[PDB]
Design a protein around this motif. Structure first.
Motif, PDB file in Angstrom:
ATOM      1  N   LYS A 190      25.694 -34.505 -17.685  1.00  0.00           N
ATOM      2  CA  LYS A 190      25.400 -33.475 -18.201  1.00  0.00           C
ATOM      3  C   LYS A 190      25.565 -32.860 -19.914  1.00  0.00           C
ATOM      4  O   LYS A 190      26.997 -32.168 -19.921  1.00  0.00           O
ATOM      5  N   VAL A 191      25.283 -33.027 -21.232  1.00  0.00           N
ATOM      6  CA  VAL A 191      25.659 -32.786 -21.888  1.00  0.00           C
ATOM      7  C   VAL A 191      24.744 -31.389 -22.947  1.00  0.00           C
ATOM      8  O   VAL A 191      23.771 -31.674 -22.538  1.00  0.00           O
ATOM      9  N   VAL A 192      25.430 -29.853 -22.855  1.00  0.00           N
ATOM     10  CA  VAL A 192      24.962 -28.857 -23.414  1.00  0.00           C
ATOM     11  C   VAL A 192      25.819 -29.268 -24.764  1.00  0.00           C
ATOM     12  O   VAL A 192      27.159 -28.782 -24.732  1.00  0.00           O
ATOM     13  N   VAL A 193      24.900 -28.627 -25.908  1.00  0.00           N
ATOM     14  CA  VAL A 193      25.557 -28.065 -27.345  1.00  0.00           C
ATOM     15  C   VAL A 193      25.138 -27.033 -27.285  1.00  0.00           C
ATOM     16  O   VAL A 193      23.895 -26.615 -28.116  1.00  0.00           O
ATOM     17  N   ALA A 194      26.144 -26.440 -28.101  1.00  0.00           N
ATOM     18  CA  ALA A 194      26.145 -24.924 -28.887  1.00  0.00           C
ATOM     19  C   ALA A 194      26.593 -25.642 -30.343  1.00  0.00           C
ATOM     20  O   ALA A 194      27.807 -25.941 -30.241  1.00  0.00           O
ATOM     21  N   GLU A 195      25.629 -25.370 -31.415  1.00  0.00           N
ATOM     22  CA  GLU A 195      25.206 -25.413 -32.702  1.00  0.00           C
ATOM     23  C   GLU A 195      26.446 -24.162 -33.247  1.00  0.00           C
ATOM     24  O   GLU A 195      25.596 -22.199 -32.532  1.00  0.00           O
ATOM     25  N   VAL A 196      27.482 -23.911 -33.860  1.00  0.00           N
ATOM     26  CA  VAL A 196      27.361 -23.065 -35.365  1.00  0.00           C
ATOM     27  C   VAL A 196      27.988 -23.161 -36.305  1.00  0.00           C
ATOM     28  O   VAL A 196      28.017 -24.345 -37.146  1.00  0.00           O
ATOM     29  N   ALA A 197      27.934 -22.104 -37.680  1.00  0.00           N
ATOM     30  CA  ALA A 197      27.691 -22.949 -39.006  1.00  0.00           C
ATOM     31  C   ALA A 197      28.650 -21.610 -39.115  1.00  0.00           C
ATOM     32  O   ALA A 197      29.182 -22.411 -40.683  1.00  0.00           O
ATOM     33  N   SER A 198      29.723 -20.909 -39.066  1.00  0.00           N
ATOM     34  CA  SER A 198      30.498 -19.965 -39.597  1.00  0.00           C
ATOM     35  C   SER A 198      31.483 -19.974 -38.364  1.00  0.00           C
ATOM     36  O   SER A 198      31.198 -19.583 -37.099  1.00  0.00           O
ATOM     37  N   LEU A 199      32.725 -19.385 -38.849  1.00  0.00           N
ATOM     38  CA  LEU A 199      33.680 -19.567 -37.841  1.00  0.00           C
ATOM     39  C   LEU A 199      33.378 -18.224 -37.569  1.00  0.00           C
ATOM     40  O   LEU A 199      33.904 -18.867 -35.534  1.00  0.00           O
TER      41      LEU A 199
END
Length: 158
Positions: free
Chosen positions: A49-58
């Motif tokens: 299972k692959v869970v993705v968490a998206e980030v735009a800034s530090l």
């Protein structure tokens, strides 16, 4: 360039028993419409299972990392590229340390990451895939190398 699916098949052998993996994804990186779907096809193909968490800034890295752990119990961290935020020293230092303190190896897109404590990266050349490994961290984490790469594995000089 090693495809995401190829990476996840490697991961399956490198970290025995892994069931769940977390990806931190830079919302400003190219190829999202390619890569994110490929990750869910790779999940299905590999059994991981692959869970993705998206980030735009530090500022978002720490909260989203905590979410991966809290909401999902991922067993490893996988970073696919480093063109922006994931090429910054602050993001690498946070993610490596926090993953290690949770018992999670880090599968990374460059040697830069290995130098700071990630376990494995890969490259593709005219003879196929070769692996580069942080020996000390890989040995401590119990990483296993597929037999076919026994002669195609380098330990990174630290």
């Amino acid at each position: 360039e090693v495809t995401p699916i190829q990476q996840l098949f490697l991961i399956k052998e490198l970290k025995p028993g892994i069931a769940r993996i977390g990806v931190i994804w830079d919302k400003n990186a190219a190829n999202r419409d390619e890569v994110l779907p490929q990750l869910q096809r790779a999940s299905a193909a590999t059994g991981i299972k692959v869970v993705v968490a998206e980030v735009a800034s530090l500022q978002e890295v720490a909260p989203q990392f905590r979410t991966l752990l809290r909401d999902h119990q991922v067993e490893a961290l996988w970073v696919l590229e480093e063109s922006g935020l994931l090429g910054q020293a602050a993001a690498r230092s946070f993610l490596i340390k926090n993953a290690t303190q949770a018992g999670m190896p880090v599968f990374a897109p460059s040697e830069t990451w290995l130098k700071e404590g990630a376990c494995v990266t890969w490259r593709k050349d005219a003879e196929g895939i070769r692996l580069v490994v942080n020996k000390a961290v890989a040995e401590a984490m119990g990483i296993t190398i597929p037999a076919k790469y026994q002669d195609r594995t380098a330990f990174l000089a630290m």
